[PDB]
Design a protein around this nucleic acid. Structure first.
Ligand SMILES: Nc1nc2c(ncn2[C@@H]2O[C@H](COP(=O)(O)OP(=O)(O)CP(=O)(O)O)[C@@H](O)[C@H]2O)c(=O)[nH]1
Length: 302
RNA sequence: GUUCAGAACGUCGUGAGACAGUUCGGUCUCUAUCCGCCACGGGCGCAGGAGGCUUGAGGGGGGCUCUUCCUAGUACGAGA
């Protein structure tokens, strides 16, 4: 809590470049989970992610005092990977994060993927960070590999903290690197609840649960919220305190805090892949400018 | 199965019969002399008599292959 320090970031790298073990390896270095560690790439939910190791959707992210005497628990994880297909999450879903790691491959080098997203994280305005991954193999000289970055990967070689996900220096700089590197995401203390839903899900039991980062206005447990479109999901319930295993208690959230908001009128379609306009009582005076989903070439023949 | 005799259908024939048209029936003799072959011996040679142990010309036998897993889902790949 408190608009002090802390920042959001979404890991972004090429396929296999190390976006599973790295995004987790840095987790089992502070706390969370006793024995049954990450196991095989955290966020491996849906069970389907397990096999094929094809990361699809695994955000959540919930840590704590992981900063060496400073801002403390402040690093909205975003295990959102991609490789030309699910650029959605890393697109709009990630847009909610003001800073995404750049785990560029140090063995295979930089590919189109990195050069692709690099453009979005440019004009979109965000604090990019490069850092070679998997530095336990023969050809992995972060040196030369870096040359491409300082002359092919946007900025130069500001020390991508080449540590690599799988084992290694356990990437301890992130807690002291990305922290002091990235600032805070606004605050909004006296304004109308105007959160911006990220992805979302379904009910099946306790209505739908769409998570997202809010700008201003803490939705306590029982606040007649609204989202432009009709908006009848009032009564509220809870802010939704994400974690590394599953939903938790959580008292109340505020601006910036990447949480969820469910309960009251579940339904299936009424909030869209995300968005939530605002709350009640003269809220935001505009709609959180979002983005499109998908509808290009490459169709199907079911 | 088809090539016998019995029998029937179809058709051909005035008729007995007939048809690479079908249909059911319907005795398979097989003591080996020689070559060949498989094993096993008999005489005898091996230029002193016998008892053991072997090399090997040479010849035969044998030679098949799939599946997961490791280096690694790494090189390749812009992914699968
Ligand atoms: N030893 C070691 N292995 C690594 C390292 N980085 C990646 N790997 C290996 O390569 C594979 C790919 O890494 P991982 O981050 O899990 O893939 P991913 O990027 O999350 C999948 P996607 O690209 O779709 O988001 C992993 O199975 C892991 O074993 C590293 O720094 N050290």
């Amino acid at each position: 809590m408190d608009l002090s320090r802390i920042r959001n970031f979404s890991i972004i790298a090429h396929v296999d470049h190390g976006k599973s073990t790295l995004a987790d390896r840095i987790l089992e270095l502070t706390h969370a989970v006793s024995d049954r560690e990450m196991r095989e790439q955290f966020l491996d939910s849906l069970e389907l992610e397990r096999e094929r190791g094809i990361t699809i959707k695994a955000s959540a992210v919930r840590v704590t005092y992981r900063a060496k005497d400073g801002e403390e628990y402040v690093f909205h994880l975003i295990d959102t990977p991609g490789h030309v297909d699910f650029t959605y999450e890393v697109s709009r879903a990630l847009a909610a994060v003001e800073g995404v790691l750049l785990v560029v491959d140090a063995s295979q080098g930089v590919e189109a993927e990195t050069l692709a997203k690099f453009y979005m994280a440019l004009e979109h305005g965000h604090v990019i960070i490069p850092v070679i991954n998997k530095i336990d193999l023969p050809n992995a000289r972060p040196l030369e590999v870096a040359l491409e970055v300082e002359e092919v990967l946007g900025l130069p070689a500001d020390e991508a903290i080449f540590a690599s996900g799988k084992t290694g220096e356990g990437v301890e700089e992130i807690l002291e690197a990305i922290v002091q590197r990235i600032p805070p995401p606004k605050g909004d203390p006296e304004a109308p609840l105007k959160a911006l839903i990220f992805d979302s899900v379904y009910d099946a039991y306790q209505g739908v649960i769409p998570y997202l980062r809010l700008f201003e206005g803490r939705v306590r447990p029982g606040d007649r919220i609204r989202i432009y479109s009709t908006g009848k999901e009032f009564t509220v319930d809870k802010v939704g305190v994400f974690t590394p295993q599953g939903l938790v208690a959580t008292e109340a959230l505020e601006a910036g805090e990447v949480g969820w908001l469910v309960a009251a009128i579940r339904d299936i379609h009424d909030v869209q892949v995300g968005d939530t306009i605002t709350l009640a009582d003269r809220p935001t005076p505009s709609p959180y400018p979002g983005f499109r989903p998908a509808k290009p070439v490459v169709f199907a023949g079911l």
